[PDB]
Amino acid sequence: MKNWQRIVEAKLEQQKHKVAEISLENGTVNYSKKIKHNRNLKALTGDEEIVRAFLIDRLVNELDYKPEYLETEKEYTIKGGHSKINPRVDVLVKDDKGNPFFFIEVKAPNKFEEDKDEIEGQLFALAQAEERDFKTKVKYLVYYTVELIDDEIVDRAIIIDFEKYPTYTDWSNGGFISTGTELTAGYGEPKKQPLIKGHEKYDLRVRIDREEIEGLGRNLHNVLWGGGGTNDSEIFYSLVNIILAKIQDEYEKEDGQEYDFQVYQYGDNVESPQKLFDRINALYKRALREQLNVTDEQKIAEDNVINRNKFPLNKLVYTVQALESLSFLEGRNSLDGKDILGDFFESIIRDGFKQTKGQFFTPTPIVKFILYALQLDKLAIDRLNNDRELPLIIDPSAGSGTFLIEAMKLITKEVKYKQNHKVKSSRQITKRFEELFMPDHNENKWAREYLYGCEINFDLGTASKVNMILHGDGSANIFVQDGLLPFRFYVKETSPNYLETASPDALYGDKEVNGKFDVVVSNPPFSVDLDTQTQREVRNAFLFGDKKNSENLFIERYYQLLKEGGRLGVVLPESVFDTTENKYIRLFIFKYFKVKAVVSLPQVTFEPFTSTKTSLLFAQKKTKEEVEQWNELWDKYGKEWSLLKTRINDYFSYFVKGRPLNKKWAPDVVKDIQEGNEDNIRKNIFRFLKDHIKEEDKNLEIKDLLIKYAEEISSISKHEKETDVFGFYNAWWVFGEVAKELDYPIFMAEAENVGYKRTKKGEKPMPNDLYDLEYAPSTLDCEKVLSSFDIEINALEASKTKLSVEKGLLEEKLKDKEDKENEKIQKRLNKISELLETIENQLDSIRSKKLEVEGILEKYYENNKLKEEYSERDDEELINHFKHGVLYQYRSEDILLRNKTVHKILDEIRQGVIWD
Amino acid sequence: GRNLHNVLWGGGGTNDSEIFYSLVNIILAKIQDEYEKEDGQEYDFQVYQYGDNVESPQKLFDRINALYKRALREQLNVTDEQKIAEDNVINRNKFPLNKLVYTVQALESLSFLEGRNSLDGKDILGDFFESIIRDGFKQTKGQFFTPTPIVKFILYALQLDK
Amino acid sequence: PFRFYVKETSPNYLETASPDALYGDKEVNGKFDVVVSNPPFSVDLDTQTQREVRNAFLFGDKKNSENLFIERYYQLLKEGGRLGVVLPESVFDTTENKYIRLFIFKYFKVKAVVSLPQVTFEPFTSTKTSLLFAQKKTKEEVEQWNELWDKYGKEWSLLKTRINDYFSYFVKGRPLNKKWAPDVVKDIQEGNEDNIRKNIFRFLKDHIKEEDKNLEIKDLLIKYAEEISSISKHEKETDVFGFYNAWWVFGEVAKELDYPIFMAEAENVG
Amino acid sequence: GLIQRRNFSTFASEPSVRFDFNYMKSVTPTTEEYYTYKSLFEVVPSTVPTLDESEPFKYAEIGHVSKNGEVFPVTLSFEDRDELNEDLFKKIEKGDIFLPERGNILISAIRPYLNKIVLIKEDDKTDIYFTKAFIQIKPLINSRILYYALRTIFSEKINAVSRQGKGYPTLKEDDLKTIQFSKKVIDNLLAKEEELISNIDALEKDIKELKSIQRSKKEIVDEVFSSHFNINMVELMALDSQRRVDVGLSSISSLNSTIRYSYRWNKMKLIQKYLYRDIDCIEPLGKYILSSNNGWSPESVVGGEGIPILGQEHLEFDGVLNVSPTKATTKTKNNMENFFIQEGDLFISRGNTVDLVGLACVVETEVTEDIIYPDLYIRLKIDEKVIHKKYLALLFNSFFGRLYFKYVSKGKNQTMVKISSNELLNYYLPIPPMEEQLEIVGKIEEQIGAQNEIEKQIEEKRNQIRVIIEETARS
DNA sequence: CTGAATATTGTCGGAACCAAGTCTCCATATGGAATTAATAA
Ligand SMILES: Nc1ncnc2c1ncn2[C@@H]1O[C@H](CSCC[C@H](N)C(=O)O)[C@@H](O)[C@H]1O
């Protein structure tokens, strides 16, 4: 029994004219005698009877239709198959001439969708029978249901002018023709489709529900995807383009101004599909100037919503019909279940898409573990508490925006809901908190200023924009152009464009640095093979922009984005950490960054797309003084290395090879060869051979000592062929000397399993080593759970009482009947006897479950919270029993952030690692 | 067929289907260019470069696209001028002009005409489609092309010549 | 449907369509000499064409791509046209495909079957395939099949009742009913004789056994009882076959017309 | 291939009018005896067993069975329900489990050519369950007789009724009820039943005796190095379990010479600090290596024409080359003679899984044929005065050469993990005096020689059973 | 009031397979191997 039933009953009790009444307590229906009734309707068989009663009341009272002209449950026996079917029509509203004007069939709100196929046997055939057997004129065929809007209920109906379309085939050929939507008083309704013409008493929709969205997704997947030609991703991108056009018909639409995203059914025929195509391509072309901010006017042309060959226009018309009446932007007042359109497009992506090798996204568990390992919740809390602001995350290479949607969820859920107790009021912070997010109708409006992800792919760029918009954000600050470009190439449209400024940096090759981004989370492509002309355009802003190892440029890019202390969490391959060809990019990270955590993920994480090994790198960025300290130490030890190499090669020239001294190589080298002093020579060789020196070679003489360590001398004396950014000083020697002076711990860890094991057939749970789920929620609405259990046990008890009354009636019948019928009667008695014993056993089991529920809730949760004894969720019993039984319905799927006990990778990387 | 991939894919970037129907149009324009030019004329299907460094990509677009619209008027027999004027060789929003430059420069020297008798038994576009397009897309549509030896055996075992 | 193909050139041979009496009053272009193709094995059809195949194809209920296309061959070819296609091994071996196997057996004249290795298509799918090399029968050669199909189907239908009444009487004790048949009750009263033996050997012509020629009547009813219900169950989709169990009927149908066809196997394609 | 010719009629046979090439190859005209499934075996319908949720039961897949009919059941409990074996519990709860009735001969449906026929002998215990993919076929002419008549003989015909069908080779019970088993086989085999079972039982008892003392080819290399260097076997596999390696910035440069800071490198450094706590024999390998080659790996055709080429499968845990080439090339390099193995070389393996990388082998076989080694090998020419190449190969195949190359070798694709010359030259192996060497070797040589000596006896009695069955059924 | 409905459950058939285990063949810089013009001398 839904709430709209209660509202309908209240309105019926509020009606001045008692023409229609319902009683949910007794489940009865009553109608005024003014209406000619062909059947006795005295019981509420379901939602259909309630909807019919409300419709009759609205017709009599609000729509001003004479009850005497109204007829209910008129029989319309027709010739169906070999026999004669006996269907009945619900509502017949006739004009003053006696001809049926409104031919209304009543259906439940849920029945209003899957029963449309029966309309052919419910509306057209019965109307034809009415016209044939009665010589009357049927005007409008109405497939009607109720629609709750504010403290009122209106008519959501499909109305067809029967004269225009006497046959169901003609109705279907025009694409489910609808002459009207809402019933008009005094025999009204226009011929043309009532245009939405929003921003008024009528709009698209604001109170959208979950069931409608689920059915919409089901039918959209059934119709658009199909099985004929094209692909599974081309259809997805076309749908994304159509949704972008729909959003464009919410950004540029003022008061009045009939919406351009609708059929425009002028007269009785749907307007030509070419007109719809043109007026949607206009919307989409206007969308690639403020949404995707494409500047080239020639690129605005030669670009369309659909190929017109892969995507037939009829599918576009159907998509417009389905999506026209659903306001994607700003419509989310289903807040009794919070945001409702985000999971819609999540289901669109999951059901329809074909992630393969080169199109796959980053698994959500890894993204969440990265976001939590950065301590981004504490970062945001401290960023808002001290100087009112939030972190200003950027995600270059953000194909589906997974690192940004999860960032939005993590910040909202843990600055408003979970960890809101760590936000100090202090007047100003309260005002900033109200401005950023609080109305609960736009919880991601702050993410219009702090999420600056980029993407090179046009299709994935638009898909990311739609992801971002449907989750309650604006995607203005997401760029569908390359992520490795001059900073001046990123223009949004608005004023705050942090990813636009640039400035030379003395400590970094006199190149551009946007020291404004707080954190950088990304999953760079594993193999970038740039074009022969795109390569040349990037060797002016990267120190190593000519190494033919372009995928490392992103790491360098990450130095140009952070702000001298910016957190950096990246999913790199293990070639970066292992192979020698990448040594330079490992020195870069050791020079400018402050490497702080390394996690080795298994070869199953990115399967069945790739078995490529991966590692999460969590590095901070050194301040302006740490880099210059490193430079000073590097220069000093390089000078030392150069002097030692000169002395050692002079020594090697004098010995082994054999020289008769020389023209005073240097004052120091030629001061002891004649004098035979060896301690200075010993210490110089030891310094130049600080690594390849053993304890057994101290006594060995110089002549053979320079032979034992001869290859090492000829190797440790070599400079770096390229990356002279270091200044010809040997990297290993100077690096070891520098690291000896300044040294910091580096947390390193390994993951055996990541929770999931996805494969070309589906997903499968595995023991997660990265993190553990909360299972038991910190906050639980205990009274809600108790009331739900009370409702279910009361329903079962009412069923038991009804069946016990039936058993008593059957026993009374058996008491005074004869054997011929007593056989069947006793069969019924035994059936109901075992049925009631089964119900009693079920009731006893549910009572035991309920008693266990009060026991567990009183032992653990107490006053709708969870006691600090189990805040770590270390107790096996609690989490195990929540992962069991009826408590599984409520549950909690949230990453547990332990503070005392540490048996997990995340639980210890959030404690051992200290971020400056 | 191998190096025209991960350069056009570009570490993500252009989709595998975009690559396919851009390359087919590029090859159509190339065939047109080989069909029009007479002895003594310079080919339009090439990149004019001053040694190193190339010309503006926009002028390459408005020399290959014009070839494409002139290709589906003399061999494809498309006569509706509206479709010709609204069609293009590639989409610049999903296929940057730099990749077009690379494709043309890779296909500058090859002669598809009169070279078809050298690579006898090598279906170019079919093999390119199989290579570029992923296996998941091909599996749910049966996009598995029968090799030249087997089709030749079929057509020669039916005595089609007889 | 053949009317959905449009071309503004020399007469579009793929546009004619007339119903065929032998194919069940369904459209037959039937102008080409050879059809060579590789069917799209096991691909879901579009809903728009899914609605139109049920009333246009002889097996439109069986929503399977490789077979709802072995008919298209029948429609396209002429009375004597040649066929060659790379079909899957499922058509040749899988039992859930007995229907198509028989279609091909009735309309087409199989003439050569080669089994390609599994190394074909190896980097992509590596599934076993074979080649059909069929030819359509003329109109005066399909009327023969049908007249035989029924000549040997009426006998099977009679034998069904006769042997299933012998089973009902000789085992699972049941008195004579006198409405069974004018020959089963006329012969049960006398004895087994040769009529019972002949009628029970004809029905069990396939399994049978020579050494079972001499033994008691209540022996050849229980050992075969599990397969008496197998050759007396007839075949679903009776609309195309005719309420027979197929294998039996087929058996003799073929025995009266014999094709010495050629078979081969390749192990290395090249 | 074949030019088999048949006649329409034929395809009338069997109630699926099938005409794939294999079946029609198996049909043939027959003149001899026939039999059916009647006077032999009988298919048994499946059933759900009453599992007891208090004791550890057993279970058996098709991979848990071997070509020799030796089941290797796993032990589940219903009190564990771990996510690693959760698939097994789920498929059991689905109804994919049954229990043989002590006398049936279970036959696998999927791919019946790999002799997965197993026997549930009458007198036995420790009841083991089975997957519905197995066919209970309980006989009437003694289990052993039918089992031995199905394993070796009656195998060209069970394999010729399989359903290829766009995927799995699969056997069906309905087709299994149609094979034309000859009587002379069963007649002769039951005629000699009284002694055939006896001598076959003796042979399989000898096989069981050999298997009771059979030891793996790796544990022998694993124990002698463990029993000679006085290192406990239960800690380096317990220290390798904990994964929280913590290092500083200074320790990165130590003996690095390429600044590598991957996790596996640091764990290698941690394990090296444990494997050498008490051993004082460690010397750098770089000063005992005189050269290093790779090989030549052209395109190769399996079982073709040309110079043979070895693969990674030819390197075993004993430092002996398998020298059993499969691939053969026909390309030239104008310097092919530089890669023709030849006896005495040491070949370390570059490129394999994270656990099979670094396995070295010495070419101890005398071959007059020139065989090329691929790019996936590394030829080491060391001084034959301090290292004793065979000992080096055994060390590389030991846990010393596993716990190092498992954590030092490089690559982003950890499915083809590869080593390089740097890891070879920067390897601090323990080299004891030449007196200590030739003792670990020699001991390992004799132990593995004994294990190989009892590896052909098993595949001599297992072949004697087959030849005796063939002779008795053919007499 | 006889009915064989339809309406589900629960279970054989079957897969342009594809999860497990483990072997590879090929681009591409390099570096060294050849010069060179240098380089003192
Ligand atoms: N400059 C660039 N060069 C190559 N690819 C880039 C790029 N900038 C962005 N990309 C895109 O970024 C994507 C990275 S793959 C990661 C997907 C996404 N970040 C996620 O977490 O789900 C690639 O598909 C690639 O197409």
Ligand SMILES: [Ca+2]
């Ligand atoms: Ca490719």
